[PDB]
Amino acid sequence: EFDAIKIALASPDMIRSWSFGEVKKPETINYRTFKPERDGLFCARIFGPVKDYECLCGKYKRLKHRGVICEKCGVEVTQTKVRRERMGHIELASPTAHIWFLKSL
């Protein structure tokens, strides 16, 4: 299919284009109930469902409801492979300098 690999820099707008949400909380797992956090580093509303065609809260749990989202979780009921291909984006309060383009010698 494809024939060439292109590589370049990524403007902030394009980075927003890639992302499917924003991370805001440094918390990951409860250690008691192994569901993810609200919108922490892991998440369901940002990255995707945890089980194949399973909304997080369990309002819909069948493949018949593919595509629709939950009205309390907002997750996209679909395969869990999406959890390996969606990317988040953090917002940085201050501008910062890429280290590679600074001490590359």
Added chain:
DNA sequence: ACCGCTGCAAGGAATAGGATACTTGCGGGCTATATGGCGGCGAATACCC
């Protein structure tokens, strides 16, 4: 038709016994200062003109 009496409670000294306020160690729940390796090489100073 008036009174001193008996009698029936209220407050002191000696024992047993549960209730209950008090004290304590934990278990899980949470948050946040090195000193024996070379070799190559290229960039970045130093230098003395």
